[PDB]
Amino acid sequence: KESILKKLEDIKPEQVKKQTKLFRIFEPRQLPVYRANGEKELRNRWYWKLKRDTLPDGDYDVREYFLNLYDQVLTEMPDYLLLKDMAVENKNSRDAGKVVDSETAAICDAIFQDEETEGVVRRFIAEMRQRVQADRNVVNYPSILHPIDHAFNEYFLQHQLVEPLNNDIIFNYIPERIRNDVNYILNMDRNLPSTARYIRPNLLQDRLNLHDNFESLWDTITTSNYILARSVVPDLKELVSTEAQIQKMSQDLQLEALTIQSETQFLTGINSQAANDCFKTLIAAMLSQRTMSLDFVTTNYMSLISGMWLLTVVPNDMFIRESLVACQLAIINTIIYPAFGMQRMHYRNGDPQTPFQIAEQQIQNFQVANWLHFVNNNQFRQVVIDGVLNQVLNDNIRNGHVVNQLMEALMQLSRQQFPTMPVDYKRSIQRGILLLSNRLGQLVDLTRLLAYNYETLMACITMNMQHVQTLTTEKLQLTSVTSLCMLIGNATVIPSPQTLFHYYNVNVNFHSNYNERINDAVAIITAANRLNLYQKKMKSIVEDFLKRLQIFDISRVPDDQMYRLRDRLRLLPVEIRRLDIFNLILMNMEQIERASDKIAQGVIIAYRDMQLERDEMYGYVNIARNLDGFQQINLEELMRTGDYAQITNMLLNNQPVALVGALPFITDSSVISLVAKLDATVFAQIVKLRKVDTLKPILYKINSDSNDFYLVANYDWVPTSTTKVYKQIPQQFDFRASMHMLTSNLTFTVYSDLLAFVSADTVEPINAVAFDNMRIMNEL
């Protein structure tokens, strides 16, 4: 009864994230430049290369790489940022400005200090500084970036989540009802500036409908909220003393010592610590919507009497059927039908009608039939208020008037002889109900108090409070109900605003975390589906979704619930941040895979003496960059279903073909390896043994640094070859065009908690008033 509360209360808010380093995938790099004819220039040139060439072989592994990249980027994706933090100083600026990142200035310095750079670029480095405008609290900082990097950074800037803050938003963050409750007064001691910001939760209701066929998890959630709610219900105050009440009860009952009586048992369970137990059980159950059973005994007729009050002010749908069926049946047999000479009863076990139903249409008395009508037709009114569903009472219970019909009924039973039964039975019953008649006003005010605290604590709920019977129940002793109904008076007790703010913050944190973890899971699921990841079993992800909901034990959960939950999660859309990041990855993933000079995008085979291309970062290369004409064979299809008949038939008969899939390669840089046709010696291993993993095409990069290049100048032969490689080239580093200006705010501040500036206090609780502007606990 303490681990669960600690699991809840230790759910921190979502730690506000931030970044200090720009997102980057690419970096410049100097390479040589070999002029056409192949020979070398005294000058070099910059190119865009990747950081972290960690791309695997095979296309499936590549798509897993981009999945893990997407997860990394979402981790790095911030919520707010100020650019002045990451800023640095350009050592070569006219106005001694600042640029945005360390690596930016490193690039600028490297380029400026070099010898082979134009004057325009150095000018452009001397002209680039930081601009402010404190009117709008806006800054523009320069930056150097690849266009993918710019895409991600700009998305981070524009789509960051912060909202201006002021005291009006501190109020409106509080629920309506509590501000509208006159019994609470609220002030503060600060005036927040326009500079201030705050992050908002995600209090979106359950997309997953755990109130439908996930009854074990729902029992868990419901229990957790129940035993939280117990922690916030007030403890009663200024109760009646137990001996002072027991003496009245005993003298009213005239307990003879010698003779045996049913009337001693009415003193069973009259202590305090049960009154508070019932008071804390009923409300917590109605808030959590957790069902509860009734343990009791058929000889303590006071329990059966107090059950009347109970079944009035608490709906029959709130209990489990067999328990209140037994209770109603006991009551019918031993208070009601003997009080009109009716039969005892003949109640079938699984009868669809509960005993108070067919009792409503046998007896002939208006008061008792009206009482029974209310009981049988009392039920929670569903109503959506301030975004949240609420299980609201009748509003004939919120005021205490039901108790008056209950009194009418009990008095119209007191005025009935029991012709069937002896004097002592009647005597017992009539005494037992005098004990409650004399507590009438206390009962009225008690009912009002319960309803008041129920709605007041309901106001501090964020998740829709569905009503469904749970697996597991809470025990309710009717002796505690008797104790509450008997020991209560002249003492209103109201939840302190601190308990209210705590019960609100707990639910808010849990609710936001629920929604955010849902978004996580849906993101990874949709991404694995759209990346065609077909071997991936989506089970670990649901474990990561449940371990983060810190109330469930996964060591004892099944493995089919995870996939049902997955089936629900696939249907949910993605949020905007994650979806847009993913779509920025999709339209650019191929371009990233073009880079990473470790794998190539396929190898052509064409038994014809084709020509090598005049690329200038290389010299002559056996490179292809269109893959048009010669047809193509995918490799994942071949590595799934080994059917090497096609490729074998094509290789043995020397048919042109292309092979498509991420494949390694070696850079060979010898003309003697070219003339001898060695790049066609790599494929004979496929037919011997039918694996395609030892497949490393040659990349004949030829230049004036290749140890035999004297031939090329001195015989006038264009290097020709067979079996070209499919691969694009790097993109040249244009400094001016790779430069950008980054907009951001200037010097805001972020606040996580929000109900700290409030300072609340109640009015004096005796002059505490309900919705009807008519006092509660006034019967004196």
Binding site: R190, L192, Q498, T749, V750, Y751, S752, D753, A756, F757
Partner: peptide
Amino acid sequence: KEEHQKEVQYEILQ
């Protein structure tokens, strides 16, 4: 507690 929870958020301002 709450007083330290208020103190952090007053101090971000102060």
